[PDB]
């Protein structure tokens, strides 16, 4: 019953499949074996299928702790009783993390369910020498946005490399400009369909896109996100917004010293740059789960900044959430990762984690349309066709 007198053998069902993720998870949890003295075995299973078959397994036989990650279904098997709480967890590490990584951590219940490990930001990249050369700042707000992308093109560059071929990539601007122009609990109220797609607010968002839009790359419907990090990495565009393990991972060891990147402008001062699509994975301790007192303790070896560095250790991209931790292993994009995740006041969980998995794919056409064809007619379809979908998907 106390984490104290939690001792014998745990099961960790994993859904780290690839190899180096297995291979740095299998370290750590020898490492946490030999530190805590509970003997950790590893299940492994091919990482679509732990998240296809998720409901089943915590409702079946599952493991003592489970890889899993922040957002909708979190908070969904907290409602359900699927997961136990783990409070008294946190009780020993709420000191390593800010009030935005113990929300994530949370159910609708204000219970702790969740220690998180890593997440990654999804902001808006650049090339030092440019801005340098060409004399751009990073803008704060959407006015000084606007003028350096005029300013771009007058200097002949496309301001924002953009593409959606592979259909997720947009999602996210649809999630930034939500955050920036009606707030975090606004998009995920949202994402829950607790307010509608019809709503005015999703009119703002594609309002305010069609404005972006003029400053985007053409063309964008058919262009893979790899050709469009390209073109930011050749200096055809002066910027691009999106994942760091995706551009920050396209670039090449010669061009990546020049990389770096700004948080997605304030529009609002309500919400300034308050929020920010971060997505975190981290631990559950499923409720049918053996031996609890035991995994509570693994948990709380794994909620320390010395347990994220090793696991990060062979990792680019990631940051650990331990409060300001700069890894030695880290570069230099992790290192502003850490500086700007942290300064955030909720983080998001990019939209196909914070809606369900289904209306985040009926979304993908519905905005691809938009971007053929960015106005209020098209706008008014849109909203009207994610409305009608997501009544069937929602129940």
């Not at 002066?238 to 991972?249: H, I, L, P």
């Amino acid at each position: 019953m106390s984490v104290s007198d939690g001792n014998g053998p745990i099961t960790f069902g994993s859904n780290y499949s690839d190899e180096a993720p297995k291979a740095a998870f299998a370290s750590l949890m020898q490492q946490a074996t030999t530190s805590t003295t509970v003997p950790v075995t590893v299940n492994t299973t091919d990482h679509n299928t732990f998240q296809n078959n998720i409901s089943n397994y915590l409702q079946g036989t599952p493991d003592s702790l489970a890889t899993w990650f922040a957002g909708y279904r979190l908070q969904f098997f907290a409602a359900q009783g699927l997961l136990t709480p783990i409070d008294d967890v946190w009780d020993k590490i709420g000191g390593t993390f800010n009030d935005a990584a113990k929300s994530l951590s949370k159910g609708l219940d204000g219970h702790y369910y969740l220690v998180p490990l890593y997440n990654y930001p999804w902001v808006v990249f650049y090339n030092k020498s440019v801005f340098q050369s060409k004399g751009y700042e990073v803008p704060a707000s959407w006015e000084a946005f606007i003028a350096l992308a005029r300013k771009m093109q007058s200097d002949g560059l496309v301001p924002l490399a953009f593409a959606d071929k592979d259909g997720w990539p947009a999602l996210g601007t649809f999630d930034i400009l939500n955050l920036r122009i009606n707030g975090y609990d606004y998009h995920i109220k949202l994402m829950k369909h607790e307010v509608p797609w019809t709503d005015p607010g999703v009119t703002k968002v594609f309002d305010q896109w069609r404005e972006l839009a003029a400053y985007q790359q053409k063309g964008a419907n058919g262009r893979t996100w790899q050709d469009a990090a390209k073109a930011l990495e050749n200096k055809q565009a002066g910027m691009m917004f999106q994942g760091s393990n995706q551009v920050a991972a396209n670039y090449s060891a010669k061009n990546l010293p020049d990389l770096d990147f700004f948080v997605f402008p304030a529009i609002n001062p309500q919400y300034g740059t308050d929020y920010m699509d971060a997505p975190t994975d981290g631990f559950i301790l499923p409720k049918k789960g053996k031996n609890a007192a035991a995994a509570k303790k693994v948990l709380q070896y794994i909620g320390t900044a010395e347990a994220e560095a090793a696991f990060l250790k062979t990792d680019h991209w990631d940051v650990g959430l331990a409060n300001g931790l700069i890894a030695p292993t880290y570069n230099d994009i992790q290192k502003k990762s850490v500086a700007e995740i942290g300064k955030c006041k909720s983080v998001s969980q990019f939209m196909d984690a914070d809606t369900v998995p289904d209306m985040a794919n009926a979304m993908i056409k519905l905005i691809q349309q938009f971007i053929d064809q960015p106005t209020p007619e098209t706008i008014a379809t849109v909203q009207k066709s994610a409305e009608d979908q997501a009544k069937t998907i929602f129940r």
